[PDB]
Nucleic acid binder design. Structure first.
Ligand SMILES: Nc1nc2c(ncn2[C@H]2C[C@H](O)[C@@H](COP(=O)(O)O)O2)c(=O)[nH]1
Ligand SMILES: [Ca+2]
Ligand SMILES: [Ca+2]
Ligand SMILES: [Ca+2]
Length: 341
DNA sequence: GGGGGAAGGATTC
DNA sequence: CACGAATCCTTCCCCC
């Protein structure tokens, strides 16, 4: 099996660059402004020019501006990036018939048939790279290997605007030399748990008793890491189906006042419904981000679909449940709809 | 003992 | 100061 992973470079920022080419070469910082105060919010993404100075996703817009006061700061336009993304996916869709659109800027292609051997895969990568740059002016990094994980890891090492193949010989090398933190799906929480177990490399996961591993990072994560360390990971390429739709907004000020929160919650619901399509959810969750940035939620599954009126009403009950069962003030509030009919 | 949901939280990208 | 969604997990519960 040959997997070709495609990852659009600094996507949001690059799109803004495509929509306004005079931006090229300048530090471009796409931000999600929260509205709690001038420049409150975080950086969603930044082009590499901004990144080489530490301005990256997750840092507050205020910290980025102190580092790069003259960069171009743009409000994130999710809808625009999604439409652009959809076009690129369609473009890729004609290269493989087997595609897994992992997110707005990532997709895996099972080109096991379309190609044979990594030379032809590599060449196909360039075909895809040139095609995307041609029709959309979007540079992407391509990762190629035997499975999604290493295909993704290949892209991680080749970005930006690169292409890399990780042959079966290197797979083995990385299995014992790649920091396990750099393995997809292993975040800081898991990375630390593995460090405390003596696992710093994928192969080290073979030094632990499975049940001890399972006990520490969960069975699913244990079997995942083990399979990769044995060079046996082989999950198929298949785009998952949207299982939930929601929206969560940040309030101007933290609150515990029902009437003060409702408007935000209702706006969340309204946008969530517009997003749903003709899709009808049977489950609804009200999600709140507490003042200490903790996330709490209360939901309910109905035996039928949820009309907007029912949503408006149940969400208020769920929000009252949250306030009733958690003392903290609420910073962000929203809803998530799932279990579509 | 354990299937099968549902619920609330943990994690990751 | 810090802004959508999938899986996975663990807990609880109904119940055969
Ligand atoms: N809003 C937001 N989007 C992020 C963040 N990190 C990554 N992304 C998205 C941006 C898009 C995709 C690739 O870049 O990942 C983040 O911290 N905030
Ligand atoms: Ca990515
Ligand atoms: Ca990317
Ligand atoms: Ca990591």
């Amino acid at each position: 099996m040959i997997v070709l992973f495609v990852d659009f470079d600094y996507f949001y920022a690059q799109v803004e660059e495509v929509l306004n080419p005079s931006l090229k070469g300048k530090p471009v910082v796409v931000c999600v402004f929260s509205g709690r105060f001038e420049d409150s919010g975080a950086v969603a993404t930044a082009n590499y020019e901004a990144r080489k100075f530490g301005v990256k996703a997750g840092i507050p817009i205020v910290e980025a501006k102190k580092i790069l006061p003259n960069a171009v700061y743009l409000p994130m336009r999710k809808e625009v990036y999604q439409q652009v993304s959809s076009r690129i996916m369609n473009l890729l869709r004609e290269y493989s018939e087997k595609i897994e659109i992992a997110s707005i800027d990532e997709a895996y292609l099972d080109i096991s048939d379309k190609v044979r051997d990594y030379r032809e895969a590599y060449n196909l990568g360039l075909e895809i790279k040139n095609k995307i740059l041609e029709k959309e002016k979007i540079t992407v990094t391509v990762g190629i290997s035997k499975n999604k994980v290493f295909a993704k890891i290949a892209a991680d090492m080749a970005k930006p605007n690169g292409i890399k193949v990780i042959d079966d010989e290197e797979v083995k090398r990385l299995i014992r030399e790649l920091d396990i933190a750099d393995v997809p799906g292993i975040g800081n929480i898991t990375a630390e748990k593995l460090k405390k177990l003596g696992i710093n490399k994928l192969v080290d996961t073979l030094s632990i008793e499975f049940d001890k591993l399972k006990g520490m990072i969960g069975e699913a994560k244990a079997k995942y890491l083990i399979s990769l360390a044995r060079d046996e990971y082989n999950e198929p390429i298949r785009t998952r189906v949207r299982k939930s739709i929601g929206r969560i907004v940040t309030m101007k000020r933290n609150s515990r006042n029902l009437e003060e929160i409702k408007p935000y919650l209702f706006r969340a619901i309204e946008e969530s419904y517009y997003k749903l399509d003709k899709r009808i959810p049977k489950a609804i969750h009200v999600v709140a981000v507490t003042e200490d940035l903790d996330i709490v939620s209360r939901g309910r599954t109905f035996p039928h679909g949820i009309s907007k009126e029912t949503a408006y009403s149940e969400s208020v009950k769920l929000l009252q449940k949250i306030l009733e069962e958690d003392e903290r003030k609420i910073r962000r509030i929203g809803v998530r709809f799932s279990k579509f009919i």
